[PDB]
Amino acid sequence: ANNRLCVSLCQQCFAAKCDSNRLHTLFTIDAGTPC
Amino acid sequence: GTPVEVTALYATDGCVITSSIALLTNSLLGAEPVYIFSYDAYTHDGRADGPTEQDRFEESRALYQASGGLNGDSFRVTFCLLGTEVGGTHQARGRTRPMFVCRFERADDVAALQDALAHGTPLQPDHIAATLDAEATFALHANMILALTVAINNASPRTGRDAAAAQYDQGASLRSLVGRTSLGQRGLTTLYVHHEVRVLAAYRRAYYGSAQSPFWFLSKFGPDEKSLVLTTRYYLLQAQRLGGAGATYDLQAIKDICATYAIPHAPRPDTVSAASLTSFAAITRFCCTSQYARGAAAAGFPLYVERRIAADVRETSALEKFITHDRSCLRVSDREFITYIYLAHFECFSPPRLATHLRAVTTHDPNPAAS
Amino acid sequence: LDEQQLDVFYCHYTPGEPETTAAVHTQFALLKRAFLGRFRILQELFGEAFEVAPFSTYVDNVIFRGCEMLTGSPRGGLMSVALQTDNYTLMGYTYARVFAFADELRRRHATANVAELLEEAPLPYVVLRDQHGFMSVVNTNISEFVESIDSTELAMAINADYGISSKLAMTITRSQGLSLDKVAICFTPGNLRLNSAYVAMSRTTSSEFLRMNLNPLRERHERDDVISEHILSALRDPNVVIVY
Amino acid sequence: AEAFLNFTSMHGVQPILKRIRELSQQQLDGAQVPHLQWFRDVAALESPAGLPLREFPFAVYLITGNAGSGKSTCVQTINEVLDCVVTGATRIAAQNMYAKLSGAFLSRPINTIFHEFGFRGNHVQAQLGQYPYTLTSNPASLEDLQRRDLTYYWEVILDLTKRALAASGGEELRNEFRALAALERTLGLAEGALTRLAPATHGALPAFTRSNVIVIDEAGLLGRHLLTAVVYCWWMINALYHTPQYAARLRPVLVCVGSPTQTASLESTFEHQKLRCSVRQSENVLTYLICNRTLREYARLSYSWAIFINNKRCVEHEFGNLMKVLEYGLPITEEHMQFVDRFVVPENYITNPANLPGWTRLFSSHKEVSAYMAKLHAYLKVTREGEFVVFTLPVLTFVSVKEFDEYRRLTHQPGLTIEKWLTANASRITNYSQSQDQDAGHMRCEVHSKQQLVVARNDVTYVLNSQIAVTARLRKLVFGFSGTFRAFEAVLRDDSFVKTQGETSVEFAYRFLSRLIFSGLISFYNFLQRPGLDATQRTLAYARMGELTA
DNA sequence: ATCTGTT
Numbered sequence A: 001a002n003n004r005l006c007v008s009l010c011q012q013c014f015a016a017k018c019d020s021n022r023l024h025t026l027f028t029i030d031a032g033t034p035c
Numbered sequence B: 001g002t003p004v005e006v007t008a009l010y011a012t013d014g015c016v017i018t019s020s021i022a023l024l025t026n027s028l029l030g031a032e033p034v035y036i037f038s039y040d041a042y043t044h045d046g047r048a049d050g051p052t053e054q055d056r057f058e059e060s061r062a063l064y065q066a067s068g069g070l071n072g073d074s075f076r077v078t079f080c081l082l083g084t085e086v087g088g089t090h091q092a093r094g095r096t097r098p099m100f101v102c103r104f105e106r107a108d109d110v111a112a113l114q115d116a117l118a119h120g121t122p123l124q125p126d127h128i129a130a131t132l133d134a135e136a137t138f139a140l141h142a143n144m145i146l147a148l149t150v151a152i153n154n155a156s157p158r159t160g161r162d163a164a165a166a167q168y169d170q171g172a173s174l175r176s177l178v179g180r181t182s183l184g185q186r187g188l189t190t191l192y193v194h195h196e197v198r199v200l201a202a203y204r205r206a207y208y209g210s211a212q213s214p215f216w217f218l219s220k221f222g223p224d225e226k227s228l229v230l231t232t233r234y235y236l237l238q239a240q241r242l243g244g245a246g247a248t249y250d251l252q253a254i255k256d257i258c259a260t261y262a263i264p265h266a267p268r269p270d271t272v273s274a275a276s277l278t279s280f281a282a283i284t285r286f287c288c289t290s291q292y293a294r295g296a297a298a299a300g301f302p303l304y305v306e307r308r309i310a311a312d313v314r315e316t317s318a319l320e321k322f323i324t325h326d327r328s329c330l331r332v333s334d335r336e337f338i339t340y341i342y343l344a345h346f347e348c349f350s351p352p353r354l355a356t357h358l359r360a361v362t363t364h365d366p367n368p369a370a371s
Numbered sequence C: 001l002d003e004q005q006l007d008v009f010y011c012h013y014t015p016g017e018p019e020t021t022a023a024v025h026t027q028f029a030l031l032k033r034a035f036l037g038r039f040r041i042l043q044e045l046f047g048e049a050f051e052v053a054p055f056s057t058y059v060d061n062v063i064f065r066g067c068e069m070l071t072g073s074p075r076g077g078l079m080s081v082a083l084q085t086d087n088y089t090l091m092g093y094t095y096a097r098v099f100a101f102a103d104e105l106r107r108r109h110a111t112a113n114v115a116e117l118l119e120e121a122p123l124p125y126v127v128l129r130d131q132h133g134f135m136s137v138v139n140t141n142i143s144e145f146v147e148s149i150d151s152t153e154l155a156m157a158i159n160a161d162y163g164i165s166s167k168l169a170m171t172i173t174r175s176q177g178l179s180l181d182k183v184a185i186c187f188t189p190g191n192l193r194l195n196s197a198y199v200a201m202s203r204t205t206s207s208e209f210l211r212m213n214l215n216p217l218r219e220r221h222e223r224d225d226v227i228s229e230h231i232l233s234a235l236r237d238p239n240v241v242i243v244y
Numbered sequence D: 001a002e003a004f005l006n007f008t009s010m011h012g013v014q015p016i017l018k019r020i021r022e023l024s025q026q027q028l029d030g031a032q033v034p035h036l037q038w039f040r041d042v043a044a045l046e047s048p049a050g051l052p053l054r055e056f057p058f059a060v061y062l063i064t065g066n067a068g069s070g071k072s073t074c075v076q077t078i079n080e081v082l083d084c085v086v087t088g089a090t091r092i093a094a095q096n097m098y099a100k101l102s103g104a105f106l107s108r109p110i111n112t113i114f115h116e117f118g119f120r121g122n123h124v125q126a127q128l129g130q131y132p133y134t135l136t137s138n139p140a141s142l143e144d145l146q147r148r149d150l151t152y153y154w155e156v157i158l159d160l161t162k163r164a165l166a167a168s169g170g171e172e173l174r175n176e177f178r179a180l181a182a183l184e185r186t187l188g189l190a191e192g193a194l195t196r197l198a199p200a201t202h203g204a205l206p207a208f209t210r211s212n213v214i215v216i217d218e219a220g221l222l223g224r225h226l227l228t229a230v231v232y233c234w235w236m237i238n239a240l241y242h243t244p245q246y247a248a249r250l251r252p253v254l255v256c257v258g259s260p261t262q263t264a265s266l267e268s269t270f271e272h273q274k275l276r277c278s279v280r281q282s283e284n285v286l287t288y289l290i291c292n293r294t295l296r297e298y299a300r301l302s303y304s305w306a307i308f309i310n311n312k313r314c315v316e317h318e319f320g321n322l323m324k325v326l327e328y329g330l331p332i333t334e335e336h337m338q339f340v341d342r343f344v345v346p347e348n349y350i351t352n353p354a355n356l357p358g359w360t361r362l363f364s365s366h367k368e369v370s371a372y373m374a375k376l377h378a379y380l381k382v383t384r385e386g387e388f389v390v391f392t393l394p395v396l397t398f399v400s401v402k403e404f405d406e407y408r409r410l411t412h413q414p415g416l417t418i419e420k421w422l423t424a425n426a427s428r429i430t431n432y433s434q435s436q437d438q439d440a441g442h443m444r445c446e447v448h449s450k451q452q453l454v455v456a457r458n459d460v461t462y463v464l465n466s467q468i469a470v471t472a473r474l475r476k477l478v479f480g481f482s483g484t485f486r487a488f489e490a491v492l493r494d495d496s497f498v499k500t501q502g503e504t505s506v507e508f509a510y511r512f513l514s515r516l517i518f519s520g521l522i523s524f525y526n527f528l529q530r531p532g533l534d535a536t537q538r539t540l541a542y543a544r545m546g547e548l549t550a
Numbered sequence E: 001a002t003c004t005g006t007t
C-alpha cells in the first residue's frame, strides 16, 4: 500500500485435489508498526 | 411606423385553464388578473437582404430604448402558455403554444400596456375583454370544437329510424350536425355550459404542463438573476423563432454557454427572498425591472450563442478526424491498441486543456465589434 | 403555568371543522403564520438548545410499550404508495384496525372464505418511519398461486406475509442491479468463474473497502471470450461512433 | 467546476440525433405492410404447426457502454428534443429513469415494457417451450427466426391475440379514428388535421398508437424471444384502430441501451413427478443482435453503433488497469496477481458476526445467507450493547382442498403429503425472491373443516430500529410526527411535499397539515421545564405569547 | 449457484 510494507503467507501443496505447481495465499497482515 | 409584434408568456395564481376559458366565453365569473412573465419584441423584415451581424444588433438595440418601453405607436400582442403544438414537423419539437391575441392602438390601451411591460403591474380583465381580436382569436379553437362535438355525439348514430320522416341518410347525420354547429363563440359557450367537466378535462391534455408554481421556475431557470432572465427568454421564446444552429440543444447546455457571457455588474438596492414565492407578484416585479432586460445587454445574447457554438465545433471536428484516421490503420496487438486508444483520448481532452480553451472564449462586451 | 398555562389561545380560539377551498386555504395560512411566529419567539428566547429539542405530534393519542404501539383509531391521514428505492426504518408493530385496508381486501379479492378466516384471526400491521420522520402504517402482503397443468388452470393457494427485506447479506446474482459502499466477498472453490469475480469486484467506487477469502487470479477458473472479441473488432471500424 | 465536466459529452451526441431522426422517417412500400387478416387467421388456430412464413419490418439503434460511463445524458437529450416513448425492463430501472428525467426539466409517468404490450397476471404461470422446431434454411432468413420465436412463446401470444380481437366489440370496428377521418373527408380539410386530435379527447388509448420510436433501458436482462413479441404487438394494435401513422407506412424503431459484459438472463423450468426445479442460462437481446449474422446484415449494425468509454469515479491507477484488463479480455500477468494479494483474509474472520460491523456479505447460495443471519440474530441477544431488540411475527398460508384433490387426480400418484408438496414448492408460491433468506422457525400445519381448508403457520424474526426495504407496491397511511423543530419548520416552509402527491388531494394535504399543526401546540411548557432554564424570561415569554395571540 | 414481469 501507500508507503507501507505487506507481509503475506503462502503455501504449496502436493495433493491431487489441491493442485501442486501452484502457489496459494492464506492471509495478509500489516508490518508497518516499527517504522 | 408599423405594428410591433410581441409574444407574451402569461401566468396567473389559481387555475390558468379555467380563467382563460371563462375569459374566452365572456362568462365574467372566474376571470382573474394576468401577470406577464417574459416577452420578446421584433419587427417584420420587409427586406430579403440579410443584414450583417453589426446591422441586426443595432436594429434590435434600437427597440428597447432605455426603460424597457418599446418604441412604437400600435402593438399586436400574442398571449401564450406552455405546451407543444401538434401536426407540425421541423428539426425539433415546440415548447410553447399560443392562446389568444390582442391589438393595442388607442392612447389609454398603449399607456396601460407600457405600464404593464415596464414596472410589472397586472392587467385587469376589462382591457383584455375590450381589446380582444375575435376573428384571429377563434381561428385557433376551430378544429377542437369539431372534435369535441363529434366525440360527444359519438353515441351510436343508427341513422335508420326510417318511419315517415325520420329516414335520414347514413352520412346525413354527421353532415347535418356539422352544418348546424357554429365554429365560433356560441358553440364553445354552449359546450362549456352543458359539458363543463369533459371540456376542462379535454383542454387540460392539449396544454400539458401549463400549471406550475413559482418555485418550479426558480429551481429550473435560476438561481441567478442574469440566468433567470436571459436563459428563460432565449430557451422558451426566441430559440424556435430564430431557428439557428442552437435550436437542438437542451437547457443544461444553454446555461453552460450563458456562464461564459461575462459582462459588467451593478448591484441592486435589494433582492428577492423566500416566503414570497406563494404568488407571481414578487417574481414579476423583480424580473421586469432588472438591468439585463433592456439596452445592449439583451440585444446581443443570441449572437454570442452562435459564435461560441461555431468556435467549439471548429476544433472538435478536426481533432476527431485525426483520431479516427490514426485508429483505422494501426496493426498491433490488443494491449498496444488499448494503450494507444486511451492515451490519445486523454492527450486530446485533458482537464487543463479544456480550462485553457474555456478561458480563451470569454467576452466582456455585448457589442460584436468590441468583443 | 400562568393563566395562559395551556396556551389560552386554545380556550379563546376554536378552529371548527373546515369548509370550501377558500376557507381551508385561509385557515391554513393563518395557522402557518401563527406557528411560525410562536416558533420564532421561542427560538429567539433560547436558541440552539431549543433547535434540537425532541418533538412528536400525532393526530390521536398513542403510547409505546416495549415493541408494541397502542392507539385509539387511525382516523385521518392522507394515503400514499411506498416506493422500492426509498429507505425506511423499522419502528414496530400495531394491532389497530383500519377500515380502508379491510374494504379493499373485500373488494379486490372475490374469495370470501379467506377474508372471513382472516377476520376471525387478525394479523398485526407494521409501523415505519421514513427519512424525513413521518410515521406510517403499511398494509399486508397477500399473494395468489394458480397452477397450469397441460391446458387447465386451477387456483391452489394463497400466502400472507409482510414483504420487507434487509440489506445485510445477499447472493452475487442479486447484486448485479445494485450499488454498495462496503463489501465482503466469499467465493467457493470448485465452480469459480471469472465473470462472477468481475461482477462482484465492481460494486464499489473505491478499493479501500474490499475483502475476500481467496485470490481468484491464482486459482483455477473458467473463461469465455466471445463478446470481448466482437467489441474489440468493432473499435477498428471507421463507421462506429466513439464517445469519451 | 461543472462546466468542463460536460464539454465533451454535449458536442458528441449530435450525430446520434441526426441518425435516429433520419431512421425514423423512412417510408415502406404498399406491398409490405401487414394486413389485418393475418391476425384473424392466427386467432383461429389450435397448434403452431400451421403458421405460414411472414415478415414484420423494424429497425434498431444500439447504445452499449460500461456501467458508470454516463449513457443517461443521451436519453435526457433524446427525450428533450425528439418525440418518443420511454420504458424500462424492471421497476427499479423505471423509477430511476423517471427520477432523472423529471429532475432535469419535465416528464410523464414511466412504466415497464410488459405493461405496454398487455401483460396480465395469469400469463405469469405459463409453460414456455413444448413443441419441437427445426430450422430448415441454409443460413436461415428472417422469416424462419421470427416463426421460431413465435413458436417458443405460443401461449402468451395466442391469449393476447384472442383477447385483443374479442374485446374490440366483437366484429364492430373501433370508431375512435374512423369517424374523424370520415368527417374530414366530407368537409374537405387538410389530411391529418382532425385525426391527430384523437388522443386529446380520449384518455384511455394505449401509448403504442402515439409514436414509433421506442426506448428500452437495461435491455441486457431480457430474453431473446422478446425482440419479436414487441414488434408483433406494435403492428397488431396499429392495424386495429387504423391510426394516422399506419396510413403513412412507417415502422417501429427500437433504441436499446445497455452493457453486454456485466449482465445476463436466466430461464427456469419445473419437472413434475420428481418435483424438481431446473435453472440455466440463455441469450439476451444485445448478444442476439451483435452475434447473429442474418440480423447483422439486415439491420446494418455497422452504421448504427455508438460506444461510451471512460469511467467517472475511479481515482486509482492499479484498480483501473485491472478493471480494463478484466473487461477487454487481455492476458493475465504476475503484476496483477501480486496486486490482488492485499485483500485476502481468513474465512472465519468474515463469517464472524463480531467483525467488520456494518459491511455487506455476498454469498453464492440461499443456505449460507440463512445460516449467517441465524448466527447474527443469536449473537445480538446475549452480547447486547443496547438500542437493539429482537422480536417475532407470524405469517400464514391457506390451501385449497378441492383444487388439491383435482390436481392429484389429474397428475395421478394418489399418495401425496401436504408437507412434502409444500416443501417442494417453496420457491414458486411466494412473490419475491428474498423469501428464502429469512430466519424462520419450525413448520406447522393444521386442517380446518367446515370451511374445508388447510392452514400453515410460521414465525419470522426481526430486529428493532434497523433499515429495511419494501419489495412491493403497498399502500401506506401517514399519521404523524415531523422530527425536530428545525426539520419540521424546513418541511413546512416548502410546498414540495404538496407537489409530490397527485393533483387530486391538495385540499386533503392542507387539511391534514392543519390538523397536525393544531395538535402540534402545547408541550411548549414541557420544554420550558428544562432544569435551570430561567426566572423572568418565562414571564417575558408569557407576555409575548399572549400579545401575539391577541 | 442462480432472477423478475402482474395495480
Ligand SMILES: Cc1nc(N(C)C(=O)Cc2ccc(-c3ccccn3)cc2)sc1S(N)(=O)=O
Binding pocket: B342, B343, B346, B347, D066, D309, D310, D311, D314, D320, D323, D324, D327
Ligand atoms: C494519465 C492517465 N489518466 C487516465 N484516466 C483518467 C483513465 O483511464 C480513467 C478510466 C477510464 C476507463 C476506465 C474503465 C473502467 C472499467 C472498464 C473499462 N474502462 C477506468 C478509468 S488514463 C491515463 S494515460 N497513462 O493513458 O495517458
